[PDB]
Amino acid sequence: NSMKNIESLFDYSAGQFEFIDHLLTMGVGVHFAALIFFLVVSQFVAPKYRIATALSCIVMVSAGLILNSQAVMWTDAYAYVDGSYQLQDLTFSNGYRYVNWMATIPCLLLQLLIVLNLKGKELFSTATWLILAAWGMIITGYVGQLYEVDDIAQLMIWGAVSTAFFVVMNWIVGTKIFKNRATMLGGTDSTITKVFWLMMFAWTLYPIAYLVPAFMNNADGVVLRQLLFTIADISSKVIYGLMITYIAIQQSAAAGYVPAQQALG
Ligand SMILES: CCCCCCCC/C=C\CCCCCCCC(=O)OC[C@H](O)CO
Ligand SMILES: *C\C=C(C)/C=C/C=C(C)/C=C/C1=C(C)CCCC1(C)C
Numbered sequence: 001n002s003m004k005n006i007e008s009l010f011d012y013s014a015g016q017f018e019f020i021d022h023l024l025t026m027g028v029g030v031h032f033a034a035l036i037f038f039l040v041v042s043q044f045v046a047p048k049y050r051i052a053t054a055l056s057c058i059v060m061v062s063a064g065l066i067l068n069s070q071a072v073m074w075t076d077a078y079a080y081v082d083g084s085y086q087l088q089d090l091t092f093s094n095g096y097r098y099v100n101w102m103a104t105i106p107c108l109l110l111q112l113l114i115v116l117n118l119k120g121k122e123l124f125s126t127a128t129w130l131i132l133a134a135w136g137m138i139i140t141g142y143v144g145q146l147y148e149v150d151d152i153a154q155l156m157i158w159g160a161v162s163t164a165f166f167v168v169m170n171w172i173v174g175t176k177i178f179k180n181r182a183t184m185l186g187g188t189d190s191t192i193t194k195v196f197w198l199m200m201f202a203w204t205l206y207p208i209a210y211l212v213p214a215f216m217n218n219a220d221g222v223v224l225r226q227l228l229f230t231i232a233d234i235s236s237k238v239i240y241g242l243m244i245t246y247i248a249i250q251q252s253a254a255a256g257y258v259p260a261q262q263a264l265g
């Protein structure tokens with residue numbers, strides 16, 4: 001998978017290579033810092049919603065381990081030689097992020113459905129269609145980026161297929177939010193609409209990074225893609241989880257859970 005990504009095509013200046021390394025390692029620290037937060041505030045969530053904050057912990061660690069794995073793969077693969085970092089081994093590839101997405105996206109979706117107060121048949125049914133649409137998106141996406149070096153045309157048509165799943169996924173998500181918004185407590189009917197618009201923005205950065213090979217095939221495009229992945233990860237995983245957590249606590253408080261009411265107090 002190494003040779004099929006544009007990272008293997010270029011040498012990098014010390015500044016480019018350390019900026020990328022620092023993006024990944026900072027990504028590690030942010031996620032593991034938020035994990036502690038999500039862990040601590042779990043005691044303040046009513047049992048109804050406590051699973052949502054647990055899913056955020058799972059996402060933080062899932063993301064933090066892959067980012068930490070990328071950081072080390074990145075430093076293993078390149079060596080500073082004659083004024084530039086040059087590929088030394090086929091150890092780095094973007095495919096591990098797509099694994100991170102296969103795993104984290106179901107958790108991110110399930111934590112949304114939980115605070116929407118779905119349950120039983122509907123929860124299990126909606127979750128199945130969302131996870132299947134999402135995996136189709138990710139899988140067709142992973143296939144396309146195998147060609148970002150060799151066959152740009154294939155990257156695009158696999159991206160087209162991937163985008164179809166994305167649109168259908170977002171339509172289901174939005175439909176369930178706007179139909180169950182009135183069931184939410186403590187005023188969170190207002191906050192969940194903002195979470196959806198956060199989702200739309202943050203999730204759309206990935207397909208933009210996915211296309212960098214086609215419109216910026218150079219080492220600065222490699223930096224830019226990683227920068228875009230870093231903003232997208234922080235927004236779609238960390239900030240989103242914080243908002244999901246805030247909604248969980250607020251509704252817990254409005255439901256008469258005292259540890260929630262004392263925390264907000
Ligand atoms: C492969 C190329 C095809 C390109 C795709 C062209 C169509 C894009 C249309 C909408 C954006 C999709 C995002 C869907 C936004 C959520 C919609 C929604 O929430 O529906 C509201 C609901 O009906 C109220 O109850
Ligand atoms: C870390 C969390 C998330 C939710 C990752 C989201 C990724 C996507 C929405 C990916 C989308 C793609 C599109 C729509 C088509 C090109 C290929 C991608 C998989 C990158």
Ligand SMILES: CCCCCCCC/C=C\CCCCCCCC(=O)O
Nearest residue numbers: 032033034036037039040041043263
């Ligand atoms: C921002 C990163 C810095 C991390 C250092 C934090 C060190 C302490 C780690 C977590 C323990 C703090 C949480 C204590 C539980 C509070 C429950 C209560 O309110 O009684």
Ligand SMILES: CCCCCCCC/C=C\CCCCCCCC(=O)O
Nearest residue numbers: 047048049051123124127128131132
């Ligand atoms: C991949 C296709 C199948 C996907 C199945 C997804 C359905 C999973 C449903 C729930 C799993 C964990 C959450 C538990 C529900 C919370 C119930 C409660 O809090 O009382």
Ligand SMILES: CCCCCCCC/C=C\CCCCCCCC(=O)O
Nearest residue numbers: 131132133134135136137139140143
């Ligand atoms: C590894 C777990 C995958 C789960 C499969 C079930 C979910 C179905 C999702 C979408 C199917 C898309 C299949 C298209 C792949 C064609 C690429 C190829 O040639 O291998």
